[PDB]
Each structure stands twice: as C-alpha cells, then as structure tokens.
Amino acid sequence: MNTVPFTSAPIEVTIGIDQYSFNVKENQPFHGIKDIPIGHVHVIHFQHADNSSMRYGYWFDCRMGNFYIQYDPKDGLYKMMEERDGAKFENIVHNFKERQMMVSYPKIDEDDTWYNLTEFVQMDKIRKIVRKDENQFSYVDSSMTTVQENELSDPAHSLNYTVINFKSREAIRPGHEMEDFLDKSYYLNTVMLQGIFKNSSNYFGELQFAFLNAMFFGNYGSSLQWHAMIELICSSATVPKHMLDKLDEILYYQIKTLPEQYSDILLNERVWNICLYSSFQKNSLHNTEKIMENKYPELL
Amino acid sequence: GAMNSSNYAELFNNDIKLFVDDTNVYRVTVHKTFEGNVATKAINGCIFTLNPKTGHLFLKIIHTSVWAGQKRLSQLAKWKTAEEVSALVRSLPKEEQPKQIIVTRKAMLDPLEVHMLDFPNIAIRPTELRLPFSAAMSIDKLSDVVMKATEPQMVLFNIYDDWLDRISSYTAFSRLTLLLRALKTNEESAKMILLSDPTITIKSYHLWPSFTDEQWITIESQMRDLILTEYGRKYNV
Numbered sequence: 001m002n003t004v005p006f007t008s009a010p011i012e013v014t015i016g017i018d019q020y021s022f023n024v025k026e027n028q029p030f031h032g033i034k035d036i037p038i039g040h041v042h043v044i045h046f047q048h049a050d051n052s053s054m055r056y057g058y059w060f061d062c063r064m065g066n067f068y069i070q071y072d073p074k075d076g077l078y079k080m081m082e083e084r085d086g087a088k089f090e091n092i093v094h095n096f097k098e099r100q101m102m103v104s105y106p107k108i109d110e111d112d113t114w115y116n117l118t119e120f121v122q123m124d125k126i127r128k129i130v131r132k133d134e135n136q137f138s139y140v141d142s143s144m145t146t147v148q149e150n151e152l153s154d155p156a157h158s159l160n161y162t163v164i165n166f167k168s169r170e171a172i173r174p175g176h177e178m179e180d181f182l183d184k185s186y187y188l189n190t191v192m193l194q195g196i197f198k199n200s201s202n203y204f205g206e207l208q209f210a211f212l213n214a215m216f217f218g219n220y221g222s223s224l225q226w227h228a229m230i231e232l233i234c235s236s237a238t239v240p241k242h243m244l245d246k247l248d249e250i251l252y253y254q255i256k257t258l259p260e261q262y263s264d265i266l267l268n269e270r271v272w273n274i275c276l277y278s279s280f281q282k283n284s285l286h287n288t289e290k291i292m293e294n295k296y297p298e299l300l
Numbered sequence: 301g302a303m304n305s306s307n308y309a310e311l312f313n314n315d316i317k318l319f320v321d322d323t324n325v326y327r328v329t330v331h332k333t334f335e336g337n338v339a340t341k342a343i344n345g346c347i348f349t350l351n352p353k354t355g356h357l358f359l360k361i362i363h364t365s366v367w368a369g370q371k372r373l374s375q376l377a378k379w380k381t382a383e384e385v386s387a388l389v390r391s392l393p394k395e396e397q398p399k400q401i402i403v404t405r406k407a408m409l410d411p412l413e414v415h416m417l418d419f420p421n422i423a424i425r426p427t428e429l430r431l432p433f434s435a436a437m438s439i440d441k442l443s444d445v446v447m448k449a450t451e452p453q454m455v456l457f458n459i460y461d462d463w464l465d466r467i468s469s470y471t472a473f474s475r476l477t478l479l480l481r482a483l484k485t486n487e488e489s490a491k492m493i494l495l496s497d498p499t500i501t502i503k504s505y506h507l508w509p510s511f512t513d514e515q516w517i518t519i520e521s522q523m524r525d526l527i528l529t530e531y532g533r534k535y536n537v
C-alpha cells in the first residue's frame with residue numbers, strides 16, 4: 001500500500017482519489033492519502049471550492065516512483081511532483097502517518113469497482129495519449145481537447161486518442177463502400193485491432209481511459225471517444241466472442257459507476273439506443289442492457 | 301448546408317452543380333402469387349442527374365439485372381445511385397466536375413458522401429425544395445429509352461431543348477419544374493395540354509414541343525390552372 005503526501009492544503013478544494021472524494025477546508029491540516037492499492041493506475045483530482053471551473057487531476061502508478069502534491073500559488077493549482085530522494089520521502093510519509101494527517105484510501109474488501117473500471121488501463125498507454133515525457137504521471141483537465149477535435153488548438157496540451165471517423169478513407173475500402181459503412185468489421189478488426197491497437201486489451205484500455213476522463217473531468221472530447229469506440233464494436237457484424245463478453249462487463253461497471261445525475265450530459269442517446277436495440281450486437285450486451293434499462297430508462 | 305427558397309439563385313451561378321434524384325432507380329410492380337402471396341417484379345429504372353444551369357441531363361439507366369440475387373433492394377438502390385454518380389464524376393474532365401451535388405432526398409446523403417470520399421472538395425448537400433423530378437418518367441422519350449434498355453446504359457439529354465437560346469436558366473428551370481409538377485399531379489391532363497394542338501410538334505432531337513414564346517405563356521398558364529384544379533379536386537376547395 002502506497003502513499004501520496006501533500007505538502008499542505010492552502011485553498012479549499014474537493015479532492016478525488018479514483019471514485020472517492022472528500023472536501024478539504026482552507027488551510028486544513030491535510031497531508032495526503034495513504035493505503036493506496038498497488039497494482040492499478042490511480043487518478044487524484046481536484047475541484048476548487050471558489051472556482052468549480054476546471055476539474056483537473058493526475059494519473060499515476062505508485063510503482064513508477066514516489067509522488068506527492070504541492071499547491072503552487074503562482075499557477076493556482078495543486079501540482080503532482082516526483083520526489084527522487086527515497087529516504088526523504090519515506091521520512092516525510094512516516095511523520096505524516098504518525099501524526100494521522102492522512103486520509104485512508106477507503107476500499108471495501110468485497111469491492112472490485114476500481115479494478116473493473118481500469119482492468120486494461122496501463123500507465124504506459126496513458127503517457128502516449130497524454131504527452132509530457134518528463135513526468136511519470138499525466139495531467140488531464142476539463143478543457144483539454146483531442147487530436148480529432150483539433151482537426152475540426154495547442155498540440156502539446158491535447159489528448160491523443162486514436163482518431164475514429166466512420167466517413168473516412170481509413171474506414172472505407174474503395175469498392176466496399178456500402179459493405180464497410182453498414183458493417184464496420186474491417187475497420188474494427190483489420191484497421192484498428194490488428195493495425196493500430198495491436199490487440200483488444202489496448203483498445204479496451206483506451207476506451208476505459210476515455211470514459212474515466214469523461215466522468216471525472218467532464219471532458220467532452222473524451223466522452224466522444226468513449227462513445228465512438230463502443231459504436232465501432234457494436235456496428236461490426238464480426239467481433240471475437242471474448243471482446244463481446246469483455247465489452248458487456250466493461251460497460252456494465254461504467255454505467256453502474258456513473259453518477260445518476262450526470263447521465264443527461266455523459267450519455268449519448270443515439271449511440272446507446274443504436275447499440276442496444278438496432279446494431280449487430282443488440283443481443284450481445286445483456287448485462288449492459290439490463291442495467292441501462294433499470295437505471296436510465298428515460299434515455300431509452 | 302441545405303438548399304431552399306432563400307438561396308435559389310445559387311442554382312444558376314457559374315459554379316458547376318448537379319441535382320441527383322434517385323426516386324426512379326428501383327421501380328416495381330406489386331402482384332399476387334399463385335398461392336395468394338404478394339411479390340414484386342422490378343422494371344428498369346434510372347438515375348436523374350441534372351445540371352440546372354445548362355439543362356444537361358445524365359440519365360443512367362438501371363437495368364433490372366442489377367437487382368438479381370440482391371437483398372434489401374431499397375437500401376441497395378441508394379448505394380447503387382451513389383456508386384454511379386461517383387463513377388460519372390470520375391469520368392468527367394476535372395474542369396467539368398461539379399463543385400456541389402444536391403440530392404433531392406436526404407437518405408442519399410451518407411451513401412453519396414461515402415462514395416465521394418476521394419473528392420473532399422465536392423460539397424454534398426440536401427435541399428428543402430420538393431422537386432418534381434420523379435415525374436421524369438412521364439416524359440415520353442425518357443420513359444421509352446429506360447423501358448427499351450436491355451443492359452446498363454447512360455444516355456445524355458438537354459432537358460431544356462433549345463430554350464436557353466431565348467430565356468435564362470432561372471426561367472428554364474421554373475418552366476421545367478412547372479411542367480414536371482403538372483405531370484406529377486395529373487399526367488393525363490398535362491400531356492393533353494402539351495399535345496392537344498397537332499400543328500406544334502416535338503422535334504426529333506427534343507423532348508418537349510416547339511412552342512413559340514407566346515404559346516409557352518399559354519401552356520404555362522394551362523399548367524398552373526391544372527395544378528390549382530387538382531389542388532381543389534383533392535382538398536375540395
């Protein structure tokens with residue numbers, strides 16, 4: 001179990017760690033988060049009390065270094081940093097733990113939610129979508145745009161999700177126009193899986209990371225990417241059985257975790273009705289369809 | 301975006317454009333089977349691709365053999381239309397290729413867009429105009445070449461005959477749409493109006509009769525009367 005200490009908390013802020021969250025008051029004696037489960041990526045995220053504009057946060061993996069948070073009064077945000085001095089870091093954490101100034105990652109033992117949401121998410125892949133090679137962790141916020149959004153404006157601050165576009169030469173083989181548009185299997189299996197992602201695990205990892213950025217930061221381009229990656233699978237007549245089985249589990253836990261009150265803005269009616277009721281895979285998503293019908297029957 | 305009454309003169313400017321109408325691509329007769337079931341029999345069809353400025357009509361005849369062994373024909377017909385329009389564009393010299401293609405039905409947008417991916421600078425547009433191009437098969441010479449076809453064929457016509465020698469392309473299109481609207485509302489009466497006078501003939505190289513300017517004014521009024529007559533007979537007014 002690992003720890004992300006905080007130097008201090010000089011501004012009132014709501015702090016998220018994965019699907020959990022807590023409020024810290026201005027100058028409250030908060031010095032970090034302990035008992036963070038090893039084996040998963042994590043995200044630590046922020047919404048200031050005085051300007052809820054810009055949710056922002058950091059994806060990290062404690063196996064890759066010792067990380068801490070420190071408020072920067074010039075740039076006005078909580079920044080993640082790496083401490084290279086290991087003895088210094090251990091001595092800081094141990095002091096803060098002895099003074100009980102840390103919150104404990106509050107994982108229920110029965111609860112596999114975070115695993116289920118991050119099953120295929122790897123830090124090395126996050127760092128290719130979010131390019132800032134001098135850090136081992138990745139910053140994301142509400143306003144960052146995607147490469148695809150930029151094409152339709154600062155490239156260093158972009159989310160480099162794989163571009164998916166159903167009316168594009170990449171998606172449509174000359175001479176198979178109708179076939180490829182109405183059945184996207186060649187785009188899914190040859191172009192994307194064999195070609196770009198190399199395997200379904202990497203495809204699912206990007207799909208899961210896109211959802212998590214949509215949910216935690218309200219990142220609109222991430223929401224677009226998540227829906228595009230669902231629609232590309234559902235609109236393919238030929239999908240390996242393991243991917244259909246895995247997609248149902250992935251989406252079930254995403255829909256389960258989504259705040260009920262954010263459904264209006266995080267769920268695309270057209271995509272979901274098409275995927276669940278019209279597409280080739282309309283009868284291949286039983287768990288996703290059952291939770292969607294019981295939790296969001298309005299949308300459908 | 302969409303083409304409507306606000307941007308109507310755009311049809312007659314010097315940017316090459318084509319209307320594409322797919323109404324008459326997939327045509328059937330519906331008939332009973334020997335067991336009392338219902339079955340369709342296809343008949344030859346056509347794509348109606350028209351330059352509204354010049355009158356040039358690219359009539360691609362769709363022979364019934366293209367449907368043999370195919371499923372979901374009404375959906376296929378849209379993709380076949382887009383394939384053939386794309387093939388026509390590729391066949392034209394660069395300086396003759398359209399800068400816009402306007403489809404008369406919104407269901408042609410995605411098929412045509414997909415087939416024209418290689419032409420990103422050709423705009424594919426819908427229209428809010430309700431154009432009567434389905435009635436093209438009420439023009440005897442067009443219907444004749446479609447029904448006689450024994451294989452796929454493209455035939456080129458000028459749907460304005462020689463009218464542009466005397467009137468503008470705005471006025472020519474208005475005349476065409478009025479004639480076609482009349483033929484669509486009451487084909488029998490419209491054709492009666494157009495031929496009632498045996499001394500006015502259709503030239504071998506034309507589609508419509510050789511009316512003088514004054515006779516066209518009479519004809520056009522008779523067509524407007526017909527359309528209002530039918531509108532009353534329909535709605536009881």
Ligand SMILES: CC1(C)CCC(N)(C(N)=O)CC1
Binds near residue numbers: 248283285287
């Ligand atoms: C039974 C199973 C474990 C796998 C198949 C399932 N995803 C389906 N048929 O949608 C439901 C859950």
